[PDB]
Amino acid sequence: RTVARDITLLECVGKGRYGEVWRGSWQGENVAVKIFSSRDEKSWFRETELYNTVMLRHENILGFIASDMTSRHSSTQLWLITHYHEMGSLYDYLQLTTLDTVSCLRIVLSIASGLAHLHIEIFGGKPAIAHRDLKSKNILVKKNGQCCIADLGLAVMHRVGTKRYMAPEVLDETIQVDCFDSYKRVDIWAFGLVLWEVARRMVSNGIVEDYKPPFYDVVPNDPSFEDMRKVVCVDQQRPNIPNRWFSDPTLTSLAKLMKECWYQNPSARLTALRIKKTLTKID
Ligand SMILES: COc1cc(-c2cncc(-c3ccc(C4CCN(C)CC4)cc3)c2C)cc(OC)c1OC
Ligand SMILES: COc1cc(-c2cncc(-c3ccc(C4CCN(C)CC4)cc3)c2C)cc(OC)c1OC
Ligand SMILES: COc1cc(-c2cncc(-c3ccc(C4CCN(C)CC4)cc3)c2C)cc(OC)c1OC
């Protein structure tokens, strides 16, 4: 039998320190091809090891297709092939797009659903998984209005995270590194930041905030570890909740939720399953 492995690389949709992402075509179908830099080879190994352990399949997790290693003359080429989401990342999408109540809730409940699926151990199943780099650039928007979580290159089963999204216990180095639940609680902090980014773009009473990344008003464009530690740990700042949210029942409920993801005490933060339940009772 013929094993068709040719993928036609059609357009670069992402370039960074990680390497590149391409829209590709296999057998008439769009796929996404991440070509890893030498900088980021260990992310390919980690994600490949995870998918060799558990074949995750969930509507809110970017769908795996393949891990490919090809011998070249003087290098190894590493590709991760996934489902392709033409609308791109949530970060991208929020720059131009504003949301109504239904779309806002559908986006955030879909992210919570993906995250709870990662976090939960299923017996008989999957190991519990923490993501460790959750952020709006690592979430893709699907045409049905739900999102999916991407990039398990730092994930842990039971490279550092993006500094802007690091929880206080990561920044002050008090994280309980021998406790898997510690890593779930770091993801919940990051989830609360993403929830803030999305809620800002939800229209109420003809008002919306411009897209901004978390802590845009208190750290530099490319913040240092120290910049983040001073804001989050020493001064204990949290993202601003605009007054206009408190006129809108959905944004009032989302402000409460994001506060309960941002407690200094990691064990006080809501779990992903509790966030889902709260979101199903809003509106
Ligand atoms: C190696 O490399 C790539 C392969 C493919 C690909 C292409 N045609 C067919 C296949 C296939 C799947 C499964 C079987 C089964 C059938 C019965 N079963 C009990 C034993 C084996 C056979 C063949 C694959 C996996 C795509 C690729 O890219 C999208 C590949 O490169 C990453
Ligand atoms: C990697 O990804 C893609 C792969 C394929 C693909 C191509 N040839 C054959 C297969 C296949 C056939 C049969 C079995 C099983 C059936 C039951 N039992 C007897 C064990 C064997 C497994 C696998 C597939 C899945 C198609 C795809 O898209 C249409 C893929 O997605 C891009
Ligand atoms: C976060 O991480 C990964 C993401 C992806 C991925 C999957 N579907 C689609 C995309 C994409 C497509 C299109 C655009 C643009 C192009 C045109 N328009 C003007 C705006 C939109 C952006 C993004 C990506 C980047 C794949 C990955 O691995 C293969 C990723 O890494 C795990």
Curated annotation (Swiss-Prot):
It is found in: Membrane. GO terms for cellular component: activin receptor complex; apical part of cell; BMP receptor complex; plasma membrane. The active site is at D133. GO terms for biological process: activin receptor signaling pathway; acute inflammatory response; atrial septum primum morphogenesis; atrioventricular valve morphogenesis; BMP signaling pathway; branching involved in blood vessel morphogenesis; cardiac muscle cell fate commitment; cell differentiation. It comes from the Eukaryota. The keyword Repressor does not apply. Changing R159P: In FOP; variant phenotype. It is a single-pass type I membrane protein. It catalyses: L-threonyl-[receptor-protein] + ATP = O-phospho-L-threonyl-[receptor-protein] + ADP + H(+); L-seryl-[receptor-protein] + ATP = O-phospho-L-seryl-[receptor-protein] + ADP + H(+). One of its GO terms (molecular function) is BMP receptor activity. Bone morphogenetic protein (BMP) type I receptor that is involved in a wide variety of biological processes, including bone, heart, cartilage, nervous, and reproductive system development and regulation. As a type I receptor, forms heterotetrameric receptor complexes with the type II receptors AMHR2, ACVR2A or ACVR2B. Upon binding of ligands such as BMP7 or GDF2/BMP9 to the heteromeric complexes, type II receptors transphosphorylate ACVR1 intracellular domain. In turn, ACVR1 kinase domain is activated and subsequently phosphorylates SMAD1/5/8 proteins that transduce the signal. This is Activin receptor type-1. The lineage of its organism: Eukaryota, Metazoa, Chordata, Craniata, Vertebrata. The chain holds residues 202 to 499 of 509 of the full protein.
